[PDB]
RNA sequence: GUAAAUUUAACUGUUAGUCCAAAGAGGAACAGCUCUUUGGACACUAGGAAAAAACCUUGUAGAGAGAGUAAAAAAUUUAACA
């Protein structure tokens, strides 16, 4: 009345974690198309307010939104006022939906534009190593070039489908 | 969320009151959960310099269960400061003298060893046996699940479950038992 | 069906890959609190020939008892309630930088 | 960024948690499988050349 | 994290190694003109 | 023209949150009739 | 007005009164106040969330 | 596979050895002890090992509110039927 591998229920008979059944691939593939279409219509009809995005810039990731300022830790060979496009968008998010790249979203889907508003240098950074000498007069001072970018806008296009 | 700045700040840093049941639970597992909540380490806004700890209420501290033989083996040692003032008592002896001492000491050790620790202890409310002051009961927001699953006793098993388990062996019919 | 996480709190999450498979789409609308899961707003609260008197409920308390009352009321230790000397008071920046 | 999202974008962070949980379950199913079955939808890796 | 898994997919163990995330241009001019190649 | 002094954060935003800043109830489920732990309905 | 919340610029008193008038113009029912969340109600530092419900 | 080597012209300073691993020779098959040899570390950095010259990881030149890693957490409870 039992299978060859039947084990009476006990504390260690089966794993403690609850068994999980994943959706059928065929059925799930259909559901994914409905979700992608629904989110696409929201973009088509402009059913979103403020947008935020995660951009990879200067070896760094920035969670930005429109009108934000980011202090880049180097010079960018650009004049103040120049308008550029931040082309590496890992994530763009809205109140009700989020788009994730694998790892980067396509240029067609999302456009993030920024402007250079200030080119400056950082405040003096002291470098002091305690070597076996009179250290004080041997303090090094470095200032690093910086660039301030203002995030002008984040635009999503209806290209999910 | 379109809240006003002052209300938004108040909600984010608001203190929450948590309830924990200590019946048949090991003190350390209770202490580990209380430690995290008392420090605010369960919040994404956590920062040590931010005083974002929460209130933890533990009931049934008298009914805690020690694994192994920790009741006899575990010794709590203190010194009055006078010559010959060293006192060593077992967990069982301490439990009878103060039903909340074991859970309190377990939490005290886990908290960071800094000046904020004694402030965190003020938000710890230990009660021996199911009675909580009405005022504290009105604060409670959430009850955290018990860390240890209490095994059922043999008498607590329903007849259906007893029948569902098979009889492994055939006892000799001539055995006294 | 199958949900990666419970959907009774915060938001309902629907995960969907695009046909090309290069983008992950997440639909997460807010979960409004059900009316049933709420409580009614608590309603707040004779030969009186003489006018009602606004008696001052301001009672003098000594430093020790006053600090003990403050510490109990806010669930803190007594130390923060004691004053500090001029050196630390003057050191504090009374025009600190403010970010939004 | 993930810490920033947890604080200021809880809905997006829950999605990321849901996505991680889904991928974790797909890994469990694959571990039980002998490889005869197909890989999970979210398991599929985009290749670059 | 994920260093061994990335190697199994033929990617660099560090996500800052080779691939679009690092090698592609960080920015371009708003009008569409390509930026000068980055120093790295 | 701003003072060349230490800048605390390398970013500034006046709108840090689009979906609502986290609070302790952001990820807590609601309960029927808002009953508290160990609270009795129909008191 | 970048970064400024509406009522920081437009100063109003008794918002509940203004809300009731605006809902009437829209034919919506009068809002009902309920306690969505509550914490530490009997303490010096309590937290309350109040939700307005129409129908 | 590498890029150093010798010679010539001048010139200066350092050099009173500690621990670890290995092989001997003396002590006691003691010492953070005596002597010699091979290699390593220590007056150049940092991470780890509880604090930590000598063990392990790593070499050392800046800025970053990015990332992948290295070393890196000690175990154990000891039979019997008549």
Can you give the three-state secondary structure of chain A, one letter per residue?
CCCCCCCCCCCCCCCCCCCCCCCCHHHHHHHHHHHHHHHHHHHHCCCCCCCEEEEEECCEEEEEECCCEEEECCCCCCCCCCEEEECCEEEEECCCEEEEECCCCCCCCEEEEEEEEEEEECCCEEECCCCCCCCHHHCEEECCEEEEEEEEEEEECCCCC
Residue G18 contacts by C-beta under 8 Å, 6 or more apart in sequence?
G12
Residue E39 contacts by C-beta under 8 Å, 6 or more apart in sequence?
none
Structure letter (DSSP) for residue B69? T
Tally Cβ neighbours within 10 Å of residue A30. 10
Tell me which nucleotides of strand H come within 7 A of a protein CB: 43-44, 62-69
Alpha-carbon span C76 to C84, nearest angstrom: 17
Paired with F4 in beta bridges are none
User: Which tokens sit at C50?
Assistant: 């003489």
Q: Does any CB of chain D come closer than 8 Å to the CB of residue A47? A: no
Are E15 and E9 spatial neighbours (Cβ–Cβ below 8 Å)? no
Nearest CB neighbour to C10, from listed F12, F26, F34: F26
Greatest pairwise CA separation for chain D in angstroms: 43
Return the residue matching tokens 């309830």: B19
For strand A97-101 and strand A89-93, is the pairing parallel, antiparallel, or unpaired? antiparallel
Residue B88 belongs to what H/E stretch?
Answer: strand B86-90
| Chain F 8-37, residues with CB within 8 Å of chain B CB atoms | 17, 20-25, 28, 36-37
How far is the alpha carbon of C36 from chain G, nearest alpha carbon, in Å?
Answer: 10
CA of B117 to C1' of H55 (A): 37
Q: Does any CB of chain E come closer than 8 Å to the CB of residue D48? A: yes
CB A104 to CB E28 under 8 A? no
Torsion of CA A9, A12, A16, A20, to 10 degrees: -60
Residue E7, classified by CB atoms within 10 Å of its CB into exposed (0-12), middle (13-18) or buried (19+), is exposed
Alpha-carbon span B22 to B150, nearest angstrom: 11
Q: Which residues does chain E have within 8 Å of residue A113's beta carbon, measured at their own beta carbons?
A: 30
Q: Which residue of C has its CA nearest to D41?
A: C17
* Residue environment code for C27-41, b if the CB has 16+ CB neighbours within 10 A, otherwise e: bbeeeebeeebbeee
Structure obtained using: cryo-EM
Q: Which residues touch strand H (CB under 7 A)?
A: A 59-61, 73-74, 122, 125, 127, 131-132, 142, 144; E 1-4, 13-16; F 8-10
Instruction: Report resolution in angstroms.
Output: 2.6
Alpha-carbon span F41 to G13, nearest angstrom: 37
Evaluate the omega torsion of the peptide bond into residue A103 and state whether it is cis, within 30 degrees of 0. yes
Alpha-carbon span B11 to E5, nearest angstrom: 41
For residue F20, which phi and psi values (nearest 5 degrees)? Answer: 105, 125
Q: Is the dihedral of CA A76, A78, A80, A82 positive or negative?
A: negative
Q: Which long-range contacts (CB under 8 A, 24 or more apart) does F30-34 make?
A: F30/C9, F30/C33, F30/C34, F30/C37, F30/C38, F30/G36, F30/G37, F31/C37, F32/C36, F32/C37, F33/C36, F33/C37, F33/C38, F33/C39, F34/C37, F34/C38, F34/C39, F34/G35, F34/G36, F34/G37, F34/G38
Return the residue matching tokens 């504390």: A11
How far is the alpha carbon of D17 from chain F, nearest alpha carbon, in Å?
Answer: 12
3-state secondary structure of B116: helix
Q: Which of D5, D13, D14 to mutate to test the interface with C (most CBs of C within 10 A)?
A: D14
């Amino acid at each position: 009345s039992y299978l060859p591998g039947y084990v009476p229920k006990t504390s260690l008979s089966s794993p403690p974690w609850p068994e999980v059944v994943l959706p059928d691939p065929v059925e799930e593939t259909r559901h994914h198309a409905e979700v992608v279409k629904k989110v696409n219509e929201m973009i088509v009809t402009g059913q979103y307010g403020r947008l935020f995005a995660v951009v990879h810039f200067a070896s760094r990731q920035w969670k930005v939104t429109s009108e934000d300022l980011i202090l880049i830790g180097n010079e960018l060979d650009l004049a103040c006022g120049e308008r550029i496009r931040l082309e590496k968008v890992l994530l763009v998010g809205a109140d009700n939906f989020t788009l994730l790249g694998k790892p980067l979203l396509g240029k067609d889907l999302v456009r993030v534009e920024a402007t250079v508003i200030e080119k400056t240098e950082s405040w003096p950074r002291i470098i002091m190593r305690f070597r076996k000498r009179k250290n004080f007069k041997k303090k090094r001072i470095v200032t690093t070039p910086q660039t301030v970018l203002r995030i002008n806008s984040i635009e999503i296009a209806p290209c999910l489908l | 969320s379109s809240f006003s700045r002052a209300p938004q700040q108040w909600a984010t840093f608001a203190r929450i009151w948590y309830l924990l049941d200590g019946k048949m639970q090991p003190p350390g597992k209770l202490a580990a959960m209380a430690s995290i909540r008392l420090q605010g380490l369960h919040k994404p806004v956590y920062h040590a310099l931010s005083d974002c700890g929460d209130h933890v209420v533990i009931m049934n501290t008298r009914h805690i269960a020690f694994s192994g033989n920790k009741w006899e083996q575990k010794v709590y040692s203190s010194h009055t400061g006078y010559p010959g003032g060293f006192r060593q008592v077992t967990a069982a002896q301490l439990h009878l003298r103060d039903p909340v001492a074991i859970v309190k000491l377990a939490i005290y050790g886990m908290l960071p060893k800094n000046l904020h620790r004694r402030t965190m202890m003020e938000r710890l409310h230990l009660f021996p046996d199911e009675y909580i002051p009405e005022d504290i009961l009105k604060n409670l927001v959430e009850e955290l699940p018990q860390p240890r699953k209490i095994p059922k006793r043999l008498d607590e098993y329903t007849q259906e479950e007893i029948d569902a388990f098979p009889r492994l062996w055939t006892p000799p019919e001539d055995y006294r038992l | 069906t199958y949900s990666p996480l419970p959907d009774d709190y915060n938001c309902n999450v629907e995960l969907a890959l695009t046909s090309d498979g290069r983008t992950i789409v997440c639909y997460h609308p807010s979960v409004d609190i059900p009316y049933e899961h709420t409580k009614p707003i608590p309603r707040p609260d004779h030969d009186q020939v003489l006018k009602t008197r606004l008696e001052e409920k301001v009672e003098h308390l000594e430093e020790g008892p006053m600090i003990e009352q403050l510490s109990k009321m806010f669930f803190t230790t007594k130390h923060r309630w004691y004053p500090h000397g001029r050196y630390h008071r003057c050191r504090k920046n009374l025009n600190p930088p403010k970010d939004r | 960024v993930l810490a920033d999202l947890a604080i200021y974008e809880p809905k997006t962070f829950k999605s990321l948690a849901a996505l991680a949980s889904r991928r974790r379950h797909e890994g469990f199913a694959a571990a039980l499988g002998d490889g005869k079955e197909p890989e999970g939808i979210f398991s599929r890796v985009v290749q670059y050349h | 994290a994920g260093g061994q898994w990335r190697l199994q997919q033929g990617l660099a163990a560090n996500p800052s190694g080779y691939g679009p995330l690092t090698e592609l241009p960080d920015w371009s001019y708003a009008d569409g003109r390509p930026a000068p190649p980055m120093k790295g | 023209g701003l003072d060349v002094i230490r800048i605390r954060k390398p970013f500034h935003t006046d709108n840090p949150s689009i979906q609502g800043q986290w609070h302790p109830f952001t990820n807590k489920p609601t309960t029927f009739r808002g009953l508290r732990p160990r609270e009795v309905q129909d008191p | 007005m970048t970064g400024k919340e509406l009522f920081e610029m437009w100063k109003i008193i008794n918002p509940m009164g203004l809300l009731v008038e605006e809902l009437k113009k829209r034919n919506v029912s009068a809002p009902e106040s309920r306690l969505t969340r509550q914490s530490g109600g009997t303490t010096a530092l309590p937290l309350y969330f109040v939700g307005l419900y129409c129908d």
